[PDB]
Structure 1
Amino acid sequence: VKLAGNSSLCPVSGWAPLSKDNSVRIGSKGDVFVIREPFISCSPLECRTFFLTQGALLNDKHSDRSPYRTLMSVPIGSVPSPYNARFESIAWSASACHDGINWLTIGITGPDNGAVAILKYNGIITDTIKSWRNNILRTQESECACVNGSCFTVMTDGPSNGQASYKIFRIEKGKIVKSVEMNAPNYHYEECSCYPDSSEITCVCRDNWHGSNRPWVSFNQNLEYQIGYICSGIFGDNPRPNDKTGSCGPVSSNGANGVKGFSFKYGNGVWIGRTKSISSRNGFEMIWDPNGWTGTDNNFSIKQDIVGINEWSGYSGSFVMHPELTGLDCIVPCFWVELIRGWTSGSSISFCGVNSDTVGWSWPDGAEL
């Protein structure tokens, strides 16, 4: 049966460690893929870690948008290895989600001025999307969000240092049944972290142009959308300035560049995941701001340490566990963090929201380079 996606997010007070692969430590002697942009998506039976690889192993001579880049997956917490990974698609930009029946995989390959998103449902090529601006067509690098047998992704075509073009897609059994181009002047959306919540999708993305707070887009199944930036003074992007009275549009100071991130909206409040360091991808923390989605103060209630400031962090993204898998009545928010090493590889650690006691530790990669 297909995921309903109509329950609310469970309210959470902390984040409990779900998984850790230790891929680089094992790949020092074992045959482990050099991986980039890992993300986790869950089926109603189990959760999988998806990753992009060029077919180069750790400690090998063969180790962004190459023709050899493929999307592969393993069960969560297992090493990305040639002997246990499942091929998904050829992709240097990818997304994947399970609608309750089969796996949808969106894989983008091709040249920078001619890229095509290849949509695969149950391993079968079902649809393709041409680049509409011929400037690096790219997608979430995280899981897509499925509601009621239909899965949703956000894709960007255009410059990563200026105004680009952002599209929302409705996909059913791998086929695009509705496409909507967002009208968002002075916005910038890269690598969206989309999750379902009460039959609607909320994506928290990255402003690579002029924003150090994170843009967001929320839409329903017929793709009527709303846009804005997370108005909290606790800025989510990296690089970013010091915490101050934030803006409700894009914060221009240290607004260029960025990192893929996420945020979970709880009414007027937001759970914010961000790096600890304001300049480099170092550290990770979860911050609960009960008025941060709309209010502009830099006041926060809960801070939980995820990765220590001396250890390397990187991409972060959301994923959810539906009631069809958990047995619960609500959608469990979860996230992963990529711990980049460097070749250039990186393992991943994942956390799921709980309403019980947790502890703020550091769970770093721990490989000797």
Structure 2
Amino acid sequence: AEYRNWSKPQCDITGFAPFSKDNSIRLSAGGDIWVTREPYVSCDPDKCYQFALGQGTTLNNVHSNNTVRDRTPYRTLLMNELGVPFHLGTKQVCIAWSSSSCHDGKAWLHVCITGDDKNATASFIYNGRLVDSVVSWSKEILRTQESECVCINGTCTVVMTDGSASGKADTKILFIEEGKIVHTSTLSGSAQHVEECSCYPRYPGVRCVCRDNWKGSNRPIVDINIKDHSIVSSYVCSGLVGDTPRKNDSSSSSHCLDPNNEEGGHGVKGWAFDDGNDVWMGRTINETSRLGYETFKVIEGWSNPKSKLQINRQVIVDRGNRSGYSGIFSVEGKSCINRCFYVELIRGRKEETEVLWTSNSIVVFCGTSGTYGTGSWPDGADLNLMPI
């Protein structure tokens, strides 16, 4: 067993093909399924796994009431093989109301964060054992990616944030080798607010596309150099923007270096990646809320902040159905690295009031150099019928 290097060029993408769907919430109307959120997908050399943060409870269960909250002591990182819904035999791999996970080609890394809001602890677990931890540095909700970290030659990188949600915060980028925090670089460059990055291996380094919760509706970009720990940062040029909330297609604008100050308060976790000078990206179809989900390629979208020339649109979830967080993950094909993505289908409170709980199901698509058609893959649960 050797360390992953990801030293392959990126596969040709013409769009995305269906990969996986757990129908979690549909199943939880007759069956004992976890109540969860902030899910993600990472894979080892052999196969793929689905992670989410649990609420220390199942759905048909009295403790599902008020699971609209983001941080409780009862939240754990859940881990199943992709396709297995989160049943009672699901492994809680750590305590976490915030996490990131990745395989370096030998073993698993989990970055797990739990504890008081003003004094969170984050634990680094490698190969089934605790190897390190770190305190919250700025004592205001130390949090991280809510999707996969990335490892290269057995140095793993993760991006974490401690500080304000709607002002300046303190973002750091850790380098972890066999569970051991070996360097901490601090956030540098033109990125102003940075959360919940969706990172991927762009050999010989790592690239993330994040969430600015403060002044931007364009997504931040952070570039991690694995060998020398240097950091550069910016935003996704593309005049069509991926955060939510945002302005409309005609009224929106962006900058390659700055927040665009366009509805920038708040955000949603999301992803994009480059392709020469083009950008592939998903986002919620609806501009103000987490409804629907779409993907497309912005031509010149990576290097030109004026371009709003989208091609290869795909409706992942239709505009009248509920969506949420999404993030990248990358799978080594035989010649090249594929890029894929998951979509959190949030059901329940506060937006839907027919029940007392908040939970999700997931959907997953992978890059394809072949061809594809159309559809919609919503949650599919009937909340009017659900465990009353």
- TM (norm. structure 1) is 0.96
- Indicate the residue corresponding to 1:335 in structure 2: 341
Stretches (4+) displaced over 3 A: none
- Indicate the residue corresponding to 2:149 in structure 1: 144
1:263-298 deviations in Å (ceiling 9; x for gaps): 011122110110100011011111101311120221
For structure 1, the residue ranges without an aligned partner over 5 or more in a row are none
Pairwise CA distance, 1:18: 0.5
For 1:335, the aligned partner's letter is F
- Asked if structure 2 preserves the Cα contact closer than 8 Å seen for 1:163 and 1:185, the reply is no
Partners of 2:289 and 2:336 lie apart in 1 by 36
Pairwise CA distance, 1:302: 1.9
- Asked if structure 2 preserves the Cα contact closer than 8 Å seen for 1:197 and 1:331, the reply is no
Partners of 1:67 and 1:348 lie apart in 2 by 24
Q: Secondary structure at the match of 1:301?
A: strand
Partners of 1:148 and 1:291 lie apart in 2 by 32
- Indicate the residue corresponding to 1:307 in structure 2: 317
Pairwise CA distance, 1:344: 0.2
- Asked if structure 2 preserves the Cα contact closer than 8 Å seen for 1:39 and 1:141, the reply is yes
- Asked if structure 2 preserves the Cα contact closer than 8 Å seen for 1:53 and 1:71, the reply is yes
- Indicate the residue corresponding to 2:218 in structure 1: 213
Q: Percent identity between the aligned chains?
A: 48
The question of 1:52 aligning with 2:53 is answered: yes
Partners of 2:308 and 2:46 lie apart in 1 by 40
The question of 1:267 aligning with 2:268 is answered: no
For 2:255, the aligned partner's letter is S
For 2:73, the aligned partner's letter is P
For 1:138, the aligned partner's letter is R
- Indicate the residue corresponding to 2:67 in structure 1: none
- Asked if structure 1 preserves the Cα contact closer than 8 Å seen for 2:190 and 2:234, the reply is no
For structure 2, the residue ranges without an aligned partner over 5 or more in a row are 65-69, 349-356, 384-388
The question of 1:39 aligning with 2:44 is answered: no
Partners of 1:172 and 1:186 lie apart in 2 by 26
Q: 1:90 aligns with which of 91, 95, 108?
A: 95
- Indicate the residue corresponding to 1:289 in structure 2: 298
Q: Give 1:46-85 correspondences, 5 Å limit.
A: 46-63=47-64, 64-83=70-89, 85=90
- Indicate the residue corresponding to 1:247 in structure 2: 255
For 2:108, the aligned partner's letter is W
Pairwise CA distance, 1:46: 1.1
The question of 1:197 aligning with 2:207 is answered: no
Pairwise CA distance, 1:184: 4.4
Partners of 1:253 and 1:54 lie apart in 2 by 34
Q: RMSD between aligned alpha carbons?
A: 1.1
1:302-321 deviations in Å (ceiling 9; x for gaps): 21111100000000000011
For 1:91, the aligned partner's letter is A
1:97-129 deviations in Å (ceiling 9; x for gaps): 111111100100111111111000012000111
- Asked if structure 1 preserves the Cα contact closer than 8 Å seen for 2:189 and 2:231, the reply is no
Pairwise CA distance, 1:78: 1.1
- Asked if structure 1 preserves the Cα contact closer than 8 Å seen for 2:122 and 2:133, the reply is yes
- Asked if structure 1 preserves the Cα contact closer than 8 Å seen for 2:188 and 2:233, the reply is no
Q: Matched residue pairs, number? A: 364
Pairwise CA distance, 1:246: 2.5
- Asked if structure 2 preserves the Cα contact closer than 8 Å seen for 1:7 and 1:199, the reply is no
- Asked if structure 1 preserves the Cα contact closer than 8 Å seen for 2:316 and 2:376, the reply is yes
For 2:289, the aligned partner's letter is S
For 1:57, the aligned partner's letter is T
Partners of 1:142 and 1:246 lie apart in 2 by 25
- Asked if structure 1 preserves the Cα contact closer than 8 Å seen for 2:254 and 2:260, the reply is yes
- Asked if structure 1 preserves the Cα contact closer than 8 Å seen for 2:114 and 2:120, the reply is yes
Partners of 1:165 and 1:269 lie apart in 2 by 30
Q: Secondary structure at the match of 1:45?
A: coil
- Indicate the residue corresponding to 1:5 in structure 2: 6
For 2:340, the aligned partner's letter is C
Pairwise CA distance, 1:82: 1.3
Q: Secondary structure at the match of 1:62?
A: helix
Partners of 1:128 and 1:271 lie apart in 2 by 35
The question of 1:319 aligning with 2:329 is answered: yes
The question of 1:367 aligning with 2:381 is answered: yes
- Indicate the residue corresponding to 1:132 in structure 2: 137
Partners of 1:38 and 1:245 lie apart in 2 by 30
Partners of 2:88 and 2:255 lie apart in 1 by 47
The question of 1:346 aligning with 2:352 is answered: no
- Indicate the residue corresponding to 1:167 in structure 2: 172
- Asked if structure 2 preserves the Cα contact closer than 8 Å seen for 1:67 and 1:109, the reply is yes
- Asked if structure 2 preserves the Cα contact closer than 8 Å seen for 1:321 and 1:333, the reply is yes
Partners of 2:136 and 2:265 lie apart in 1 by 24
Partners of 1:226 and 1:358 lie apart in 2 by 36
Higher mean C-alpha deviation, range 212-221 or range 296-305: 296-305
